[PDB]
């Protein structure tokens, strides 16, 4: 299973990491790592900033995990446009809570993409949360029960 994702210089989108091949520039305090992306090959390999542009993989959200998605959060969000659909950093502007049903979460999230400042209302299917929001599932168990 993939553990990490990395931001591509081509498009500013985030992609799953297949392997870290090498690293450099540690002595600078700002190391880079040579990334082989999942589903791609050697041609798409990049040197990527370790501190800011590599991270633990975002978590596709299901069911009542929506309680861990709050206004203000950074999320990784699937941006479906006219001719492309890629995962981009976005911030949640608003969380509209709605009745869950047999297919799970019906909540709607107004998001703003960080790279183009565009705004969209998305369903939970498009939302991947950062692992550092997991703790909220423990706090908000009663909200999960309510949903």
């Amino acid at each position: 299973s993939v553990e990490f994702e990395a931001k591509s210089a081509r498009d500013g989108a985030w992609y799953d990491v297949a392997a870290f091949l090498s690293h450099r520039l540690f002595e600078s305090g700002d190391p880079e790592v040579r990334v082989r992306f999942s589903g791609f090959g050697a041609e798409e390999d990049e040197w990527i900033n370790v501190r800011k542009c590599v991270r633990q993989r975002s978590l596709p959200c299901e069911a009542t995990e929506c309680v861990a998605v709050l206004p203000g959060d950074l999320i990784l969000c699937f941006q479906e446009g006219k001719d492309q659909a890629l995962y981009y950093d976005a911030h949640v502007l608003d969380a509209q809570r709605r009745r869950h049903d047999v297919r799970g979460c019906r909540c709607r999230f107004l998001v703003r993409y960080d790279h183009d400042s565009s705004e969209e209302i998305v369903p939970l299917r498009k939302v991947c949360r950062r692992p550092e929001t997991d703790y909220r599932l423990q706090i908000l168990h009663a909200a999960r029960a309510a949903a």
Binding site: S1, Q84, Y87, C128
Partner: peptide, 14 residues
């Protein structure tokens, strides 16, 4: 890990 939605890529240029 759960599967992400499949990326759809394009060259741009329109």
């Amino acid at each position: 890990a759960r599967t992400k939605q499949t990326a759809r890529m394009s060259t741009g240029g329109k």
